Structures are given as C-alpha cells and as structure tokens.
Amino acid sequence: ECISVKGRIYSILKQIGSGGSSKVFQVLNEKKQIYAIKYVNLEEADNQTLDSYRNEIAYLNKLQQHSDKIIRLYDYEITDQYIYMVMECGNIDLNSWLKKKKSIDPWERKSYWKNMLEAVHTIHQHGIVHSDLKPANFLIVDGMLKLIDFGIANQMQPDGTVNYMPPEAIKDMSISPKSDVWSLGCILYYMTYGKTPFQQIINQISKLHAIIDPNHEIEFPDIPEKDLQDVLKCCLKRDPKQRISIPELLAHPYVQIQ
Ligand SMILES: O=C(NC1CC1)c1ccc(-c2cnc3c(NCc4cccs4)nccn23)cc1
Numbered sequence: 001e002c003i004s005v006k007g008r009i010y011s012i013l014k015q016i017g018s019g020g021s022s023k024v025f026q027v028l029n030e031k032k033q034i035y036a037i038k039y040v041n042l043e044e045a046d047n048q049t050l051d052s053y054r055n056e057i058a059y060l061n062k063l064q065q066h067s068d069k070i071i072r073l074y075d076y077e078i079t080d081q082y083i084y085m086v087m088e089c090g091n092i093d094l095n096s097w098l099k100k101k102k103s104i105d106p107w108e109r110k111s112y113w114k115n116m117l118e119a120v121h122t123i124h125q126h127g128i129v130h131s132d133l134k135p136a137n138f139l140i141v142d143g144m145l146k147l148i149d150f151g152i153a154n155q156m157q158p159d160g161t162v163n164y165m166p167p168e169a170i171k172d173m174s175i176s177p178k179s180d181v182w183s184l185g186c187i188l189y190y191m192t193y194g195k196t197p198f199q200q201i202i203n204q205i206s207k208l209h210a211i212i213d214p215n216h217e218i219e220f221p222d223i224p225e226k227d228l229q230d231v232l233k234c235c236l237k238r239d240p241k242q243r244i245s246i247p248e249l250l251a252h253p254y255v256q257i258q
C-alpha cells in the first residue's frame with residue numbers, strides 16, 4: 001500500500017483519521033522518516049468544499065513561517081481529482097493524551113498552554129478565528145503542542161462534542177476572537193481539574209442550557225496555582241466583551257512569572 005506525491009513515494013503504516021472524502025495516513029518516506037499524509041478525494045465535491053480546502057492549504061502554507069506551533073506542511077499536490085498534503089506526524093493528539101493521563105504535571109500544563117496561546121495568537125494575526133477548538137485539534141510533536149488546523153474545512157474524526165462551544169455561538173442563533181479564548185479556557189480547565197466545565201451534564205440539550213445560562217455558576221476548586229485559577233475565571237466569562245483577550249493572556253503572570 002503506497003502513496004506518491006510530487007515525485008516521492010510513501011508506505012502507508014496506519015490510517016489515523018477520516019472525514020468528508022478525506023483520510024489521514026501515517027506513512028514512511030524512502031529514508032524511513034515518519035510523516036502524516038492527508039488525502040482528499042475531490043470527485044464528488046461542491047465548489048464550496050473545494051474552496052474551503054484551497055483556503056486551508058493557502059493558510060497552512062502562509063502560516064508556516066510565522067509560528068512553529070502550527071503543524072508543518074512539507075509539500076502538497078492538488079489536481080481536479082485529489083489533494084495530498086505531506087505534514088508532520090505527531091506522537092499523540094491532545095485528546096488521546098489527556099484521556100491516558102493520571103495527573104498533569106504543573107510545568108508541562110503551563111508549557112502546553114503557552115503553546116496553545118502562541119498558535120491561536122498566530123492565526124488571529126492573520127484574520128482567522130478557529131471557532132471549534134478542542135483537544136483533538138492540538139498535537140504533541142517534539143516537546144511541544146502544535147495546532148493542526150484552522151476550522152476552515154471539515155474536521156477529521158479519529159480511526160462529536162459541545163463541551164467547548166462558547167455561549168455567544170449558541171446565543172447567535174436568532175465572529176469574535178474571544179470565542180477561541182472560551183474554548184482554550186475549557187481545555188485548560190480540563191488540564192487542571194480533569195473534567196471540562198460541563199462534563200458532568202450528560203444530556204446534550206441540557207448541556208447547551210448551562211453554557212448560555214448566567215445563573216449557572218462554574219465551580220473553581222482552589223489550587224496551589226492562584227494564577228491558574230484566575231486564568232480559568234477570565235477565559236470562562238460568559239460575556240465576550242469582558243472575557244480576557246489573547247494578548248492579555250500573554251501578559252498574564254500565569255505565563256510570564258517563572
Ligand atoms: O487535516 C489536518 N490539518 C488540516 C490543516 C490541513 C491534519 C490532520 C491530522 C494531522 C496529524 C498528524 N499526526 C497526527 C496524529 N498522530 C498520532 C497518531 C495516531 C496514530 C498513529 S500516529 N494524530 C492525529 C492527527 N495527526 C495533521 C494535520
């Protein structure tokens with residue numbers, strides 16, 4: 001089982017994901033290095049879908065030079081029939097790593113948050129609001145967390161959830177960078193307390209209710225890191241105008257004082 005891309009040949013080791021007409025494979029080049037190749041079948045694809053994938057590739061190419069907390073794109077090939085993207089392969093996604101972990105190391109949680117902030121900061125500077133951040137969107141490679149996509153095209157499922165949905169995303173059924181702060185908050189909450197803020201409410205219709213509800217209060221058990229407590233509280237403010245910004249989160253003692 002092989003894949004060729006712009007001259008070069010690759011052996012499929014394992015399929016790691018699949019979505020709308022796309023598949024992500026862990027593969028090897030001739031020198032026995034590991035990559036992740038994404039394949040998209042374009043045969044039965046809208047002009048909307050095509051344009052979203054074109055928009056994804058352009059943004060991923062551009063955003064290469066600006067942060068190394070964005071997945072590396074080594075090469076790509078696009079025709080009317082398919083797209084191949086040769087990207088970095090990670091060790092493990094952040095969702096799978098959080099589910100395997102007993103207790104999160106305080107220094108390693110702070111390192112990861114820094115990484116997430118840098119990645120999301122970067123896409124914001126180029127006018128992208130992701131809008132659907134989850135642990136599944138971050139990948140552990142080398143020592144660092146990297147963002148793997150931009151919420152531009154359809155997300156890959158591993159081979160959903162509303163636990164990270166911001167209140168204004170539910171309230172706007174009748175886009176701000178503050179929306180990414182909420183979701184990033186929820187990942188940090190999970191990294192801190194072992195649960196997302198509303199992971200206790202199993203009913204999805206009931207889950208959407210607590211997120212929008214001012215009179216529902218999120219609990220914050222006290223911890224050694226009083227800075228971390230505060231970061232969590234400012235990210236998880238229901239009113240987006242009063243919610244903390246990425247550039248503020250970067251000036252925050254939790255991230256600055258070592
Ligand atoms: O589609 C992606 N990004 C859009 C901008 C183009 C995308 C999807 C998956 C990956 C990727 C690259 N590496 C991984 C990975 N690695 C852990 C593994 C799981 C199984 C074998 S390795 N798990 C999940 C996803 N991985 C990178 C980019």
Ligand SMILES: [Cl-]
Pocket residue numbers: 177178181244245246247
């Ligand atoms: Cl912001």
